[PDB]
Antibody
Framework: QVQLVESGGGVVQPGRSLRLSCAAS????????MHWVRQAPGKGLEWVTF????????YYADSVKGRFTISRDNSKNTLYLQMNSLRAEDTAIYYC???????????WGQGTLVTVSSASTKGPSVFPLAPSGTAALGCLVKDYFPEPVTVSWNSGALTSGVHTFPAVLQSSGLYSLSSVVTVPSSSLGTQTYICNVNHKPSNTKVDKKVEP | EIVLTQSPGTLSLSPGERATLSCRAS???????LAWYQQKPGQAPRLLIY???SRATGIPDRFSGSGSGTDFTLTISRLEPEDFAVYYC?????????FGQGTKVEIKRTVAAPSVFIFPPSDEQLKSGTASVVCLLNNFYPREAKVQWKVDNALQSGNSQESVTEQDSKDSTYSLSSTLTLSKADYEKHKVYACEVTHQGLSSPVTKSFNRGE
């Protein structure tokens, strides 16, 4: 039916520029007004900017006035957000949204993620969390950037009992993460438990055997 | 500077039970230009209610909105598994299109006490010059717990970080990991490392510990 498709997300350093685009189909584009709405990691929704059908009325939240530019090209059915002088606090998923005739945001795009950090791509350091009826052992996946990271146990052969925690952001700009799994303690001497950690942005995959 | 305040922050019910979510406005939404949105985990929001009582096209009948002035309510009459999400209220039509901070509806189960584990820093980490001590709270409910670290019975503060899983799909519990950061020099000075956990399901706080180098 009516679809909104967003394209422009990515990872950039602070102070830089980045243009988001929202291609729209399934309706007459130039008859509705459009919005950008952003959502920081683990936080609520926040209205960003508004544009009318004509293009002669643009409104901006105080967070972004003077740095963000909303625009639309009806001949291509596209809404744009030019983001300038980017700050770390701008890190969020950005949605385009349509205002129905009646007033609310009736159709939302799928969301592009935008990350603003001064860190450089960095593979993680992996350390074993050794164990000592049921026992626990795990993996410390430390000091990587950016998200995400894929953790698997025994190459995916071990899924029952696995907890991979969400990454906490450290003061350095790098993320850190822990994955654990509980096992029958009777297996610590016989079964081998190998951490598998994949960080696609840095081109690093490593395996760490975890032992008493 | 209108503030929409949603309550409660988190709402914990069993499946099949009725859910009531509230949105209080700092000033009156005289137009009743109030919307409710559903955001399922990992998805963009979808409009549920507009004009504060009008069901959007293609929304199940169990969702319903009511209220006026400064107080609006969203009612989910029979919580299906797909209904356990976060819900935002919104005033539209005017200056900031302000949102509420959101209400999360999670699955209610009986209390579960966490299984506690402590992990000493690995030799590999120490060889790199850092020391991380990890305490794990496994499969507990409800989500609120507190973890205290004691290095030789000295209470730490400001040097630990904690992450929490989302509600498990099979048994609706939570898991928590706490990571104490010390300098390698500090870790080598003291002997006994303990994490002390307090939780609803524990009669008295459970303490798991280890002495360094053993």
């Amino acid at each position: 039916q009516v679809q909104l498709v967003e394209s422009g997300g990515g990872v950039v350093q602070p102070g830089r520029s980045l243009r988001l685009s929202c291609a729209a189909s399934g309706f007459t584009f130039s008859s509705y007004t459009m919005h950008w709405v952003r959502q920081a990691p683990g936080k609520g929704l926040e209205w960003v900017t508004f544009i009318s059908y004509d293009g002669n009325n643009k409104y901006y939240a105080d967070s972004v006035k003077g740095r963000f530019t909303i625009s639309r090209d009806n001949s291509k059915n596209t809404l744009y957000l030019q983001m300038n002088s980017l700050r770390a606090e701008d890190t969020a998923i950005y949605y385009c949204a349509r205002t129905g005739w009646l007033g609310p945001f009736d159709y939302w795009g799928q969301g592009t993620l935008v990350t603003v950090s001064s860190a450089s791509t960095k593979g993680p350091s992996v350390f074993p969390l050794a164990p000592s009826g049921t026992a626990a052992l795990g993996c410390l996946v430390k000091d990587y950037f950016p998200e995400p990271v894929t953790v698997s146990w025994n190459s995916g052969a071990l899924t029952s009992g696995v907890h991979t925690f969400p990454a906490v952001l450290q003061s350095s700009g790098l993320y850190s993460l822990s994955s654990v799994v509980t096992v029958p303690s009777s297996s610590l001497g016989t079964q081998t438990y190998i951490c598998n950690v994949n960080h696609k942005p840095s081109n690093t995959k490593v395996d760490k055997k975890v032992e008493p | 500077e209108i503030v929409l305040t949603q309550s409660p922050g988190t709402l914990s019910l069993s499946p099949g039970e009725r859910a009531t979510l509230s949105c209080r406005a700092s000033q009156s939404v005289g137009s009743s230009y109030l919307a409710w949105y559903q955001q399922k985990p990992g998805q963009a929001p979808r409009l549920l209610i507009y004009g504060a009582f009008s069901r959007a096209t293609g929304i199940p009948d169990r969702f319903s909105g009511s209220g006026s002035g400064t107080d609006f309510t969203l009612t989910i009459s029979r919580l299906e598994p797909e209904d356990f999400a976060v819900y935002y209220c919104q005033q539209y039509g005017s200056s900031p299109w302000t949102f509420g901070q959101g209400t999360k509806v999670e699955i209610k189960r009986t209390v579960a006490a966490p299984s506690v584990f402590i992990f000493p820093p690995s030799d590999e980490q120490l060889k790199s010059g850092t020391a991380s001590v990890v305490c794990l709270l496994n499969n507990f409910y409800p989500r609120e717990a507190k973890v205290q670290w004691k290095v030789d019975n000295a209470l730490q503060s400001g040097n630990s970080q904690e992450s929490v899983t989302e509600q498990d799909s099979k048994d609706s519990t939570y898991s928590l990991s706490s990571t104490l950061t010390l300098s390698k020099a500090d870790y080598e000075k003291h002997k006994v490392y303990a994490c002390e956990v307090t939780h609803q399901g524990l009669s008295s706080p459970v303490t798991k510990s280890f002495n360094r180098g053993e």
